[PDB]
Write a protein that binds this ligand. Structure first.
Ligand code: NI
Lengths: 114, 115
């Protein structure tokens, strides 16, 4: 079903303190607006889902595999399914758009219940 | 594929049609496409088997998906299932929209490679 979204009206959910997420999806795509509070860590994880990210606001230190990059608006990244990554913010926090294919089923349920 | 980081100032631009300037990157299943559209420009009606989503970054875009028409501005987003007909137009300000495809659009991938 084709759809239009206003993100000011998409309810947010928190999988972990310091994170607020607004997730929408089609069949094979999920878009997730992640607002991360200052000085907050996303613990290291992997998943079969391919992921991409687009910086919108603030600063994010991202580790994908062996690499550690500091990311700001104007930057984007791609992560193959199965590749380990973790992240952290500094003083300013960040807003990052995460993209998954296929959608993350756990976030889908949390978005439904938000 | 291999993990990759991109600086948009370094991603080369291509134009599939007058009034459109694009920068595309892709993983395997995902393509991200930054589309700058000139003022008062029409995107002719099309359908594609690829799934599409879009995120407004700057300006204004009137988008028609199947039966519904909406005017989109930053703060808004859209989803288009594979095969669903859509068209769009800009007004005086033009726009910047982030288009997302799964799987990647073959034509855009080739133009990005040649950019
Ligand atoms: Ni992840």
């Amino acid at each position: 079903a084709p759809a239009f979204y206003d993100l000011t009206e998409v309810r947010s959910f928190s999988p972990l303190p310091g994170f607020a997420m607004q997730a929408i999806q089609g069949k094979n795509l999920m878009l997730n607006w992640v607002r991360i509070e200052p000085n907050t860590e996303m613990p290291a994880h992997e998943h079969p889902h391919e992921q991409a990210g687009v910086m919108l606001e603030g600063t994010l230190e991202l580790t994908i595999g062996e690499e550690t990059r500091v990311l700001r608006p104007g930057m984007a990244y791609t992560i193959p399914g199965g590749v380990r990554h973790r992240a952290r913010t500094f003083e300013d926090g960040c807003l990052v758009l995460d993209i998954f294919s296929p959608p993350r089923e756990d976030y889908a349920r949390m978005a439904e219940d938000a």
